[PDB]
Structures are given as C-alpha cells and as structure tokens.
Design a protein around this ligand. Structure first.
Ligand code: ATP
Ligand code: ATP
Lengths: 240, 220
C-alpha cells in the first residue's frame, strides 16, 4: 500500500513502495510486450493492402503512425529491461561513492569530444537512502545530455545542507525554450530542435529521471543556464 | 528535517503517485499516434471502400486502443470463446509467413475460471513462438478431461537443448542459438498459467522441434 504507513517505520514503508513499483513495472513491460503483436498483424495488413491497391496518402499515414507506435514500444521495452536489470533494494549510500565513477567517466567522455567538464564543487560523503543504480543513472543521463547538447563546456556542482544535496548541471549549448522547460520531463517528449537534429530517439531520459527523483522524495527542475544553455537542478534529502 | 508537515505531505503524495503518473502519461502518448492511425484507416475506407486488409488494420487498431487504455487503470469462460480468435489470427499470420498451421483438435465449450486476457496471451505466445522458430509447420492440439484442458503446441524448427528447457521460462532469457539469428514471452506464459493453478512444460516435439504443453484446471 505504502499506506502500510498506518503503524510502520519509514524503511518498511519504502520497501512497500518498492513492492508496488515492481508490479507497476511488470504491468508496463507485459502491456508493452503484448502491444507488439496486434501491431505486427496490422503491419501485415497494410503490406498486403499496398500490394493490392498501391501507394496512398492515407496508407502512408497509417504505415508511419504504426511505425511510431512500434518504435515507442520498442524503446519502452528497452527501458523495462534496464529498470528490472536494477534490483531496486533501497540502501544507505554516501554521495561521493554513488557519483564519482559517473563523473570521472563524464570527464573522460567530455575530453574525447574535445569539450571540457568542470566540477565546481565535488560530492562529499553525504548520506542518502535509495537505489544506487537509479540515482547514478539519474545523474549520467543528465550529464550525458549535457555533453551531447553542449557547444564547448559542461559544469557540475554539488551543494550540501542540513536538509539535502543540490546537484546543478550546466552547458553552453542551445537552451530549451521557456515553454518546453515544463514539457521536457514528459515521456516521448522531444523538442522540435532535437527532431531537426535527427539523431537518436526516445524522450524517456528525463521522464525516467523525474520519476526516480520524485520516488526518492526529491525534485528536478530545468532552467536557463548561466553558461547560456540548459540547467538541471536535482534536490535530494539527507538520511539520518 | 527542516521541512513543514505540508512539504512532507507533498513529498509523500508525489512519491507514491509517480509511477502511476508515468504509466498514464505513457498511455496518453501512445494514444495520440494511434488516434491518427485510426483516421488514416477511416479516410482510406472513405476513399477506397471496404477490403479484407482494411478490416484487418481496423480491428488490430481497436485492439491497440484497448490495451493502451489498460495502462491507465476471475470470471467464467468457455475455452472455445476464449481462444478461437487467438487461433484464427495465428492462422492469418501463418499463411503470410508461408508456414502451415494445423489444429488437430479445436477447443470446445469447456469451463475455465480466470482472467481471459491472461490466458489468451498465454496461448498466443506459445503458438506465435512456434510460428517464429518453426521451419515449415505448426500443430496445435486441445485435450479435455474431467480435470482440465491440455494444449499441445509443436513445430518442425530447431529444438532447445534439454538443459535450457527449464531456463527458457526465466524472464529476459534467450538461448545462445536464438542470440545468433525481449525474453518475456515464456515468462508471461509461466506467470499466467501458474496464476490459474495450472502448469507449463517444454519437451521434445514429434515434429523434431520444440513442444510446449499447457495444462489448466477446469471450473466447477
Ligand atoms: N542538454 C540539453 N540541452 C538542450 N536540450 C536538451 C538537453 N537535454 C535534453 N534536452 C531536450 O529535452 C528532450 C528530453 O530528452 P530526454 O533525455 O528526456 O530524452 P533524449 O535525450 O531525447 O533521449 P534518451 O532517452 O536517449 O536520453 C531532448 O530530446 C531535448 O530535446
Ligand atoms: N518454438 C520454439 N522453438 C525453439 N526455441 C524456442 C521456441 N520458443 C521459444 N524458444 C526459445 O526460448 C526463448 C524464450 O522465448 P520468449 O518467448 O520467452 O522470448 P522471445 O520469444 O525470445 O521474445 P518475445 O518476448 O519478443 O516473444 C526464446 O528466445 C527462444 O530461444
């Protein structure tokens, strides 16, 4: 329930939260899997139709939309594989252990593109409670996005407080129109500029991030970056 | 620690409702391209009239419509109502693949009690796997008894090594043989059948390929 809360300790509560999420995830991967077959048949139907009556504006529309669904579903299952490839068990972890590998790899990666990665303040031994892999992925996705869309530089900044950790990621690349700053976290949502880019697919990254982070009782925000591009702010509570 | 009771409450609400919100958002996003897909068939039916193919497209679109709708949110059934569409569609698909599908004995009006969709997917996955891995032929056979229904599926394709016959039902697992040419199919099957107090098994097939046997209990 998580409403296991009538009586229970915080830890027990989250395990009940972990129990629910896994079934929600089983549901999503089972439906994702099962959507593929009628879809397969539909495509055999269009194919057979194109053979009998040839190309059409209408048929072309049906075929491209069927391909959109096909693609989304494929990406949904790729995701499902990864989130269940993660065991979920929530544990106490120090911020530095949790994200140092991620940041070091990002420095290596930034260096290859010829770009620069700068850590304004590194993470310390600050206590968190959660799924280590999930929070790691949250940060690699935010920084990999930054490395990709940046023009020359990336910046990462940690901040600690009696209350929590605040992670800030910045890039000097193109921004995100103010309207889209709310929308970028919706699933399958990409900006017209990344659709013009025409590279990559999926718009799950930030949807996965927002979900994980809310599940970890924190929050995420997209803003104008002082470097001129995009700013991502993660806040997570301390565990005591 | 510093937080207001209100901040606690919102943190808590958002925390429990995030996956729900995620799934309902995924559902919304799949629904819009689908809505367009349905007007393409509609506009096409306007332009070029009825066709078997157009009918096919339309019903498949109505199925997608229903399952995406599930993302947002046991009964008594007769085996024949439960699985005939699964089988008819398996026949449609088989004809296109250039393969042959044979039903040695069809299901009758045999009482079952469970989730119709779960059991449908259970059978559909077993025969559709058989259409995939088969070389030329597939055979489906029903059997009834005072106790239950036993569905047997056979193919003439490559088999599965005896060691792997237990593993293939594990989720996200595929044999190394299949890895040269998702792995939820037989996991979905095992789950639904076990949930209906039945069982699933992989064996040697008389056709030379793989044999899958589903047993489900009858209803009182
Ligand atoms: N650093 C960035 N600068 C500008 N826009 C960005 C940046 N990162 C993301 N966006 C915009 O927000 C969208 C959401 O991206 P998100 O990570 O959710 O999916 P994605 O990066 O497109 O694909 P993937 O799922 O493979 O990461 C992106 O397509 C892009 O349009
Ligand atoms: N009829 C068959 N003949 C031979 N091998 C099979 C047969 N059915 C399943 N297998 C093997 O067992 C594995 C389990 O398949 P399962 O249905 O669980 O996933 P899948 O069919 O590979 O993928 P999907 O989930 O998309 O159907 C397959 O990858 C395949 O190696």
């Amino acid at each position: 329930q998580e409403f296991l809360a009538a009586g229970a300790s915080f830890n027990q509560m989250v395990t009940a939260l972990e129990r629910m999420m896994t079934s929600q995830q089983r549901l999503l991967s089972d439906i994702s899997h099962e959507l593929r077959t009628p879809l397969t048949r539909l495509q055999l139907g269009t194919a057979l139709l194109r053979r009998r009556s040839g190309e059409s504006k209408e048929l072309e529309r049906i075929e491209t939309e069927a391909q959109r669904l096909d693609s989304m579903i494929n990406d949904l299952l790729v995701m499902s594989r990864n989130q269940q490839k993660n065991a979920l068990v929530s544990e106490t972890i120090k911020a530095n252990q949790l994200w140092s590998e991620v940041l070091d790899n990002a420095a290596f990666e930034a260096e290859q593109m010829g770009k620069s990665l700068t850590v304004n303040f590194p993470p310390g031994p600050w206590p968190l409670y959660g799924n280590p892999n999930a929070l790691e992925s949250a940060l690699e996705n935010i920084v990999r996005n930054a490395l990709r869309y940046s023009h020359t530089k990336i910046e990462v900044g940690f901040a600690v407080d009696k209350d929590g950790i605040t992670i800030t990621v910045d890039d000097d690349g193109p921004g995100v129109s103010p309207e889209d700053r709310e929308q970028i976290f919706r699933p399958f949502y990409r900006t017209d500029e990344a659709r013009d880019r025409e590279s990559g697919g999926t718009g799950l990254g930030l949807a996965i991030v927002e979900t994980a982070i809310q599940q970890h009782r924190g929050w995420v925000k997209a803003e104008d970056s002082p470097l001129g591009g995009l700013r991502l702010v993660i806040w997570l509570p301390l565990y005591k």
